[PDB]
Design a protein around this ligand. Structure first.
Ligand SMILES: N#CCC(=O)N1CCC[C@@H](n2cnc3cnc4[nH]ccc4c32)C1
Length: 288
């Protein structure tokens, strides 16, 4: 029923991103062919396996079930299955921050952080595990609002368990992964909290390249480090309390929140509700 979009009326404008077996394009949906249609974002499989099709169908059903100010809006589907979403004109929070860092102060990062926590808490409410929290997957709707913007790796918890075990082919964002995701392939609300700690780290480094999680972890492990052993060495590092450093300029109270997200003890990480509470309290206090 979703105002199904006809493919012939979708006009390609440019690519927005890639995965991951996915890609997102900016298109103009122009059914009257008079150049008055709205611009939308279109996600499609970059190589349409039938297994990837199944995952994509599931991704679509997930986004469709989500309605929240901080979750990118589902608009419909076009079928060659394509997912149609609203286009957020500021693009990803990653690129936004890279290009506007002199305009975006700490209070503003905490506003975004708070919105990300609210979005994630809403997911947890549906027993959805995001599994890929990272600033390149957060979108900027306007200067005052961000949204979680991709759900390609999102899973629903089994009914009887608080974690979902999954091992995917090819490449993982290991430098955002909780220890138990690396060692046991276990993903849970708590591993999303671990990765949220890494998102907060990213925000406060202002996406400085030499400071990215991969660069810092690689540097702590040693870049004689030869790729298969990398995960093994990363595991050992985390187990011995190796951690991303406090970013330049970051207050101790904000770093403390990161470090608490990065607890090896899965059950000792903060909830997203407590995170929002704490972040909002630091905001109110930075007011004056
Ligand atoms: N496949 C895939 C990932 C991808 O292409 N991304 C990551 C998630 C955000 C994507 N993106 C980049 N700029 C965007 C603007 N609006 C968007 N609406 C939905 C997605 C979306 C936008 C890019």
């Amino acid at each position: 029923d979703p105002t199904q979009f006809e493919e012939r009326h979708l006009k390609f404008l440019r690519q927005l991103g890639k995965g991951n077996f996915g890609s997102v394009e900016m298109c103009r949906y122009d059914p009257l062919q008079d150049n008055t249609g709205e611009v939308v974002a279109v996600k499609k499989l970059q190589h349409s396996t039938e297994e990837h099709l199944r995952d994509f169908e599931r991704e679509i059903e997930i986004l469709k079930s989500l309605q929240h100010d901080n979750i990118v809006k589902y608009k419909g589907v076009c079928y060659n299955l394509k997912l149609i979403m609203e286009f957020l004109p500021y693009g990803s929070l990653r690129e936004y921050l890279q290009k506007h860092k002199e305009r975006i102060d700490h209070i503003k990062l905490l506003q975004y952080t708070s919105q990300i926590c609210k979005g994630m808490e809403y997911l947890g409410t549906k027993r959805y595990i995001h599994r890929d929290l990272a600033t390149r997957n957060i979108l900027v709707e306007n200067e005052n609002r961000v949204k979680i913007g991709d759900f390609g790796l999102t899973k629903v918890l089994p009914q009887d368990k608080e974690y979902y075990k999954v091992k995917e082919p090819g490449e993982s964002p290991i430098f955002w992964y909780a220890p138990e995701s690396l060692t046991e392939s276990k993903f849970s609300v708590a591993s999303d909290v671990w990765s949220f700690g890494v998102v907060l780290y990213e925000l406060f480094t202002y996406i400085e390249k030499s400071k990215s999680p991969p660069a810092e972890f690689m540097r702590m492990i040693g870049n004689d480090k030869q790729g298969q052993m990398i995960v093994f060495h990363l595991i050992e590092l985390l187990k011995n309390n190796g951690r991303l450093p406090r970013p330049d300029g970051c207050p101790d109270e904000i770093y403390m929140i990161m470090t608490e997200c990065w607890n090896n003890n899965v059950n000792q990480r903060p909830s997203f509700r407590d995170l929002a509470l704490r972040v909002d309290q630091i905001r109110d206090n930075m007011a004056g």
